[PDB]
Amino acid sequence: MALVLLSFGVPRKAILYPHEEPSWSLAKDIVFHPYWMIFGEVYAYEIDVCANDSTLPTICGPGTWLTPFLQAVYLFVQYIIMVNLLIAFFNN
Amino acid sequence: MALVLLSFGVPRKAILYPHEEPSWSLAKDIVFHPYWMIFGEVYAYEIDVCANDSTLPTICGPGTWLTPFLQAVYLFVQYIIMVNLLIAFFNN
Ligand SMILES: CCCCCCCC/C=C/CCCCCCCC(=O)O[C@@H](COC(=O)CCCCCCCCCCCCCCC)COP(=O)([O-])OCC[N+](C)(C)C
Ligand SMILES: CCCCCCCC/C=C/CCCCCCCC(=O)O[C@@H](COC(=O)CCCCCCCCCCCCCCC)COP(=O)([O-])OCC[N+](C)(C)C
Ligand SMILES: CCCCCCCC/C=C/CCCCCCCC(=O)O[C@@H](COC(=O)CCCCCCCCCCCCCCC)COP(=O)([O-])OCC[N+](C)(C)C
Ligand SMILES: CCCCCCCC/C=C/CCCCCCCC(=O)O[C@@H](COC(=O)CCCCCCCCCCCCCCC)COP(=O)([O-])OCC[N+](C)(C)C
Ligand SMILES: CCCCCCCC/C=C/CCCCCCCC(=O)O[C@@H](COC(=O)CCCCCCCCCCCCCCC)COP(=O)([O-])OCC[N+](C)(C)C
Ligand SMILES: CCCCCCCC/C=C/CCCCCCCC(=O)O[C@@H](COC(=O)CCCCCCCCCCCCCCC)COP(=O)([O-])OCC[N+](C)(C)C
Ligand SMILES: CCCCCCCC/C=C\CCCCCCCC(=O)O[C@@H](COC(=O)CCCCCCCCCCCCCCC)COP(=O)([O-])OCC[N+](C)(C)C
Ligand SMILES: CCCCCCCC/C=C\CCCCCCCC(=O)O[C@@H](COC(=O)CCCCCCCCCCCCCCC)COP(=O)([O-])OCC[N+](C)(C)C
Ligand SMILES: C[C@@H]1CC[C@@]2(OC1)O[C@H]1C[C@H]3[C@@H]4CC=C5C[C@@H](OCCC(CO)CO)CC[C@]5(C)[C@H]4CC[C@]3(C)[C@H]1[C@@H]2C
Ligand SMILES: C[C@@H]1CC[C@@]2(OC1)O[C@H]1C[C@H]3[C@@H]4CC=C5C[C@@H](OCCC(CO)CO)CC[C@]5(C)[C@H]4CC[C@]3(C)[C@H]1[C@@H]2C
Ligand SMILES: [Ca+2]
């Protein structure tokens, strides 16, 4: 579940923030939001940053349309596969 | 699950609110938010109170960077261990 977390956070930060200097904040940002998605937080108005109801309208830029597809795959793997695999692990 | 709740609420209130007089509101605040986290509410914009998108920007202060780590551990224990232990209890 932690490798799936990093498989999503690194491209999302890379696509949405293309103009970053090296900083230890990059370690925070690739882990932070994808972790809280395991626990119910979809960040509904930060998906599709180029939409009209977005709370991150300045992050809209070249290629940020990829991130809704990335997050759809992420949560399918996390809730629908890995959380239910973990329920099933405990039962048996 | 109730002791894990108090193991998290007391330090979060202590770290984020260091200048409190004795009041019965302290009994409320160490229980209130950690309980609603069991039920889907991550309080996404109150995590990392020193961030730019925070809804509690005046709570930023010395040592408030500890609370995202505390809440990550809390919800791992609550959903991923204790809720699934309770699903498994009912099944068997
Ligand atoms: C629930 C616990 C996880 C939570 C963290 C707390 C851990 C608490 C304690 C846990 C007890 C440890 C259990 C046994 C393992 C022993 C040490 C070890 O690492 O060994 C393995 C090497 O490790 C690897 O091959 C992978 C190393 C990556 C670890 C990164 C942690 C990511 C999860 C972090 C969470 C991210 C959350 C994001 C997703 C929600 C190999 O195993 P071994 O050494 O051969 O020993 C195995 C058994 N034996 C002795 C019979 C051989
Ligand atoms: C999975 C992959 C993860 C990534 C790996 C790489 C990790 C590299 C880590 C690098 C950390 C060091 C770089 C920063 C230097 C300190 C200054 C700093 O940033 O201060 C900030 C807090 O942050 C801290 O004080 C540091 C946080 C320390 C804990 C980091 C955990 C790393 C390992 C895991 C251990 C976990 C425990 C369990 C272990 C078994 C304070 O500033 P601010 O918050 O920005 O707020 C600004 C406003 N203010 C001035 C009012 C404050
Ligand atoms: C024991 C079992 C093993 C656990 C696994 C490993 C644990 C993960 C370890 C991660 C390493 C830690 C990442 C932070 C790096 C340092 C941050 C820093 O220097 O500055 C930041 C401080 O911010 C913080 O100190 C808060 C960090 C975020 C909380 C992480 C919660 C854990 C979620 C994940 C848990 C699952 C992880 C899944 C693994 C893939 C801010 O940046 P700054 O430049 O200081 O200031 C910017 C100013 N600004 C804020 C105003 C904009
Ligand atoms: C689902 C129910 C819990 C919900 C609350 C409602 C309770 C409803 C009713 C429940 C019926 C009671 C079942 C049996 C126990 C009898 C009384 C008792 O306490 O006995 C135990 C002492 O108690 C302790 O050792 C711990 C005391 C702390 C209780 C605090 C409540 C926290 C949960 C609150 C929720 C926080 C939620 C936060 C997390 C989500 C010892 O047991 P005993 O006395 O020896 O008897 C056991 C069996 N015997 C007779 C065979 C020996
Ligand atoms: C787990 C650890 C928990 C902590 C333990 C310590 C507990 C100590 C408890 C202390 C309560 C007494 C102190 C306050 C005095 C009354 C005045 C007051 O605050 O009024 C407020 C409401 O609140 C109340 O009226 C009181 C709430 C009573 C229920 C508390 C449950 C305690 C035990 C559990 C029983 C649960 C049932 C199940 C039992 C089996 C009204 O004011 P306000 O809301 O601020 O709004 C202001 C605006 N206004 C003026 C328009 C209103
Ligand atoms: C039966 C089975 C056992 C159950 C277990 C024990 C139950 C827990 C018992 C907790 C004790 C009660 C805590 C409140 C204390 C009194 C509040 C007070 O005096 O004032 C507050 C009134 O606020 C309220 O009256 C609302 C209290 C919060 C709701 C609690 C929901 C239960 C969540 C947890 C359930 C799981 C608990 C898990 C256990 C760890 C406000 O403060 P004030 O100073 O009056 O005014 C401030 C003004 N202001 C509001 C404008 C800012
Ligand atoms: C393939 C599956 C079936 C789908 C069929 C239908 C789709 C066909 C497939 C792919 C469509 C690719 C082009 C679409 C972009 C058009 C709009 C656009 O300009 O967007 C952006 C650029 O976008 C680019 O420059 C494209 C970047 C390359 C993407 C590499 C493959 C992505 C899919 C993975 C590989 C596929 C396999 C994945 C596994 C399933 C916007 O940037 P801009 O142009 O500068 O806009 C102005 C911005 N400004 C105003 C801020 C300055
Ligand atoms: C250790 C695990 C691996 C992590 C490695 C990397 C991290 C290395 C470890 C720890 C880093 C500790 C220092 C980081 C703070 C730097 C930034 C800073 O100033 O932050 C705060 C102060 O912070 C303090 O004064 C530190 C408080 C002591 C923390 C005690 C241990 C915490 C971790 C538990 C023990 C560890 C074991 C836990 C089990 C895993 C900000 O306060 P300030 O300075 O006044 O800022 C100005 C504020 N003003 C503008 C509002 C006025
Ligand atoms: C197998 C996994 C692949 C992904 C990953 O885990 C292992 O690989 C790790 C390597 C880390 C980087 C290493 C070095 C630096 C340089 C530093 O430079 C200080 C700049 C400035 C501070 O303000 C000086 O003042 C900033 C941080 C950065 C870029 C790390 C970011 C996180 C990274 C990408 C980690 C990530 C979670
Ligand atoms: C084993 C567990 C350890 C944690 C815990 O449970 C048991 O221990 C309990 C003890 C409680 C405190 C006892 C006394 C007071 C003094 C009172 O003084 C009136 C001030 C003002 C009112 O406005 C006068 O006007 C304010 C409340 C406070 C600090 C309690 C807070 C909650 C505490 C910390 C409880 C907490 C849930
Ligand atoms: Ca939910």
UniProtKB/Swiss-Prot annotation, chains A, B:
The impact of changing N92Q is: High constitutive activity. Abrogates the inhibitory action of intracellular Mg(2+). Abrogates the inhibitory action of Mg-ATP and PIP2
Q: Where in the cell is it found?
A: Cell membrane; Cytoplasmic vesicle membrane
The residues exposed to the Extracellular compartment are: 18-19, 61-63
Residues crossing the lipid bilayer are 1-17, 64-92
**Phenotype reported upon loss of the gene:** Inactivation of Trpm7 in mice results in early embryonic death (6.5-7.5 days). Mice die as a result of trophoblast defects and consequent failure of implantation. Tissue-specific null mutants shown defects in cardiac and renal morphogenesis, organismal Zn(2+), Mg(2+), and Ca(2+) homeostasis and thrombopoiesis.
Q: Which residues lie within the membrane without crossing it?
A: 20-60
The reported effect of N91Q is: Abrogates the inhibitory action of physiological intracellular Mg(2+) concentration. Does not abrogates the inhibitory action of Mg-ATP and PIP2
**What tissues harbor this protein?**
Found to be expressed in brain and skeletal muscle, with stronger signals in kidney, heart, liver and spleen.
Top-level lineage group: Eukaryota
- PTMs? Autophosphorylated; autophosphorylation regulates TRPM7 kinase activity towards its substrates. The C-terminal kinase domain can be cleaved from the channel segment in a cell-type-specific fashion. TRPM7 is cleaved by caspase-8, dissociating the kinase from the ion-conducting pore. The cleaved kinase fragments (M7CKs) can translocate to the cell nucleus and binds chromatin-remodeling complex proteins in a Zn(2+)-dependent manner to ultimately phosphorylate specific Ser/Thr residues of histones.
Q: What does it do?
A: Bifunctional protein that combines an ion channel with an intrinsic kinase domain, enabling it to modulate cellular functions either by conducting ions through the pore or by phosphorylating downstream proteins via its kinase domain. The channel is highly permeable to divalent cations, specifically calcium (Ca2+), magnesium (Mg2+) and zinc (Zn2+) and mediates their influx.
As for family, the record states:
In the C-terminal section; belongs to the protein kinase superfamily. Alpha-type protein kinase family. ALPK subfamily.
Q: How does it assemble?
A: Homodimer. Homotetramer. Forms heteromers with TRPM6; heteromeric channels are functionally different from the homomeric channels. Interacts with PLCB1.
What's the protein name?
Transient receptor potential cation channel subfamily M member 7
Residues shown, of full length: 1007 to 1098 of 1863
